[PDB]
């Protein structure tokens, strides 16, 4: 019944934070039009 800790809310926030990255990457790729928008994507494809 604990009201000092909300573990379930922490799990939900963790899942939302995990999901944020995919949305950000998808919007960036849609706007720029290139799959490789940075070195963190591939950077082997970027060098090529």
């Amino acid at each position: 019944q604990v009201i000092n800790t909300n573990s379930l809310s922490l799990i939900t926030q963790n899942n939302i934070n995990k999901n944020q990255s995919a949305l950000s990457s998808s919007i960036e790729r849609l706007s720029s039009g290139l799959r490789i928008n940075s070195a963190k994507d591939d950077a082997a494809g970027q060098a090529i």
Binding site: A43, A44, A47, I48
Partner: protein
């Protein structure tokens, strides 16, 4: 009544003790999940690297990324400690008191999971034979430990429920 009170206090303390083992297993499982994600990305990297299209500089970049993720695996293994105990740094076991009398322990097992104990020591893709087989072997070897941890968690939860019922009845 004196013996009954002793049993009540012992069983309540035992349930509290079992909660600790549940927490330990959960933390170790989370660390293992992160290691699994790193291993999956490394496997994808090797699949991309073992191609004739790539030049030498491309292989160097892929190796740089692979080595960085392997060092991340090793760091997550070494640094993760629970209650001043480095769970993923040495083969060992814990004995969780889940009873009122002596020798009432449920044994949790901890396996040293790192590059050396997974075969990925010196893993390189530039100037390693059968890289994908070794990577799959490591993935299965961490999956086995994860399954053991889950089984221990289920056992501990069942123990907690049984202790609660017994305490109420007594």
């Amino acid at each position: 009544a004196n013996r009954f009170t002793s049993n009540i206090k012992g069983l309540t303390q035992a349930a509290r003790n079992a909660n600790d083992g549940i927490s330990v297993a959960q933390t170790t499982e989370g660390a293992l999940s992160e290691i699994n994600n790193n291993l999956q990305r490394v496997r994808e990297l090797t699949v991309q690297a073992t191609t004739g299209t790539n030049s030498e500089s491309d292989l160097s970049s892929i190796q740089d990324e692979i080595k960085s993720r392997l060092d991340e695996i090793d760091r997550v293994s070494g640094q993760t400690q629970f209650n001043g105990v480095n769970v993923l740094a040495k083969n060992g076991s814990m004995k969780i008191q889940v009873g009122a009398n002596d020798n009432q322990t449920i044994t949790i097992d901890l396996k040293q999971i790192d590059a050396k104990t997974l075969g990925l020591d010196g893993f390189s893709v530039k100037n390693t034979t059968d890289p994908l087989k070794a990577l799959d072997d490591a993935i299965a070897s961490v999956d086995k430990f994860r399954s053991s941890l889950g089984a221990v968690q289920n056992r501990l939860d069942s123990a907690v429920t049984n202790l609660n019922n017994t305490t109420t009845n007594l």
